[PDB]
C-alpha cells in the first residue's frame, strides 16, 4: 500500500493513499477528531471513524 | 451515535450496514478470503471500494487514530 503523509500545520494530517487495486483517495485528519475521505467526499466524527475503523480493520 | 447491522454472508464472509447520526449511508462486506468492499449511495449512484486485508488493516489504523 502506498501512502503519503502530510503534516498541515492548523489543519491537522492528510493521508494521500492508492490501493493495489489503482484507487485514489484522500484522507484528511482535522485536529478536532473529524475525518474527512475524499475520492466524492464523506465526513465522519472521531467516535465514529474508530467505530467503522474497528469494523474495518477486522 | 452509530446505526450498524450485521448479517451473515452464507460462503462469503459478513456484511455491515452502516448509518451516523450525520446519516451516511455505507456498506462495508468483509469476505471470508481478507478482501474489503465498501459502498456508497451517492451521476454515480453506489459507489464501490476494493481493498484486501493489509490495506483495509492500514486504512483502519489511519483512521481509528
Redesign the interface.
Known sequence: ?N?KENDLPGIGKK?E?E???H?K?T?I?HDDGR?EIY??N?????????????????
Do not use: N, P, V
Open positions: 500500500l501512502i493521508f493513499i490501493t493495489r487495486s484507487e483517495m484522507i485528519i475525518r475520492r466524492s464523506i465526513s465522519l466524527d472521531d467516535s465514529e471513524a474508530r467505530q467503522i475503523a474497528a469494523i474495518l480493520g477486522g
